Nucleic acid binder design. Sequence first.
DNA 1: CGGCATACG
DNA 2: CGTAT
DNA 3: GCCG
Length: 326
Amino acid sequence: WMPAYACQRPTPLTHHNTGLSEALEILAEAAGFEGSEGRLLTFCRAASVLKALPSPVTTLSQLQGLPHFGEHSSRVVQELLEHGVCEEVERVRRSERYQTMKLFTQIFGVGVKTADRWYREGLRTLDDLREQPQKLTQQQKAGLQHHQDLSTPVLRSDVDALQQVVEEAVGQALPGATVTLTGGFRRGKLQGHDVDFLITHPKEGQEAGLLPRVMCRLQDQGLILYHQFERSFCIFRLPQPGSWKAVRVDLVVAPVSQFPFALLGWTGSKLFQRELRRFSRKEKGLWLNSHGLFDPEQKTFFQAASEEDIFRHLGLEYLPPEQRNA
DNA sequence: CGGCATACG
DNA sequence: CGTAT
DNA sequence: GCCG
Ligand SMILES: [Mg+2]
Ligand SMILES: [Mg+2]
Ligand code: NA
């Protein structure tokens, strides 16, 4: 009944097993901090399965036959059902390693590998990093300076304001160019930690060279607190009552021939796209990315005019963005 | 046991 | 190495 | 950690 790939089933934003999925996602996150991508994936997938169920899991037997539930994930659920708490999960939560790796990896410019090195050097706090700024990149310096604002959720009201200012700069950079909201907000989220925009133009090729022109205009408007092509990871100045706050904004440009693939990729979720690409390659023999869908036998790319086209060419039932919350 | 998504900056 | 979904 |  429950298919094995997350792209084969609807996953709504809110569901009936929130606490169970959150516990599994703690273990997934911890596995990632230790470099165990395989364990991270299994725990992520098991969490996602529960998000897709039509009602709460109340008994252990309801896990029988669910994909990605083996001894470990099942035991986690069993303990939560019987005692409201899983000792392993709580042990991770309070560990100095988990808390510090989470704190460090949250910094824009710091990945697992950097965080881990710092952890091994004895660093534990943000002020520990500030007191040795010679070791930080310019990106990390920006992430650390803006860390407090960047930890505050972006609201859907903020998004509309940012979109209008991005369209203004885009319209001057290239008349006729369009801006599409992607990422978590396109899946229906009411809050987020960043805002993702996809930019294109209806005349193939006109979008070449566009992103530098957009960025230089935004910067001239005084809206860019930080930025470093076709992808830009920025920190924007967002107006606030009597002041402002820093917000992470990603801008991506794609040619209109590739727009369906880029929209699909950048709308996520992250797990959904990984599962979709795994499904494409392993079940259909097709290679999927955010630029296209390649048949390695015929050596041809699939033309798509819509996301609907892509789901059809992979033999999957269409899922709107709000059901891609794997 | 191999595999685990696939890019760009 | 970082970033993104 | 789990699947095929
Ligand atoms: Mg986002
Ligand atoms: Mg983003
Ligand atoms: Na980071």
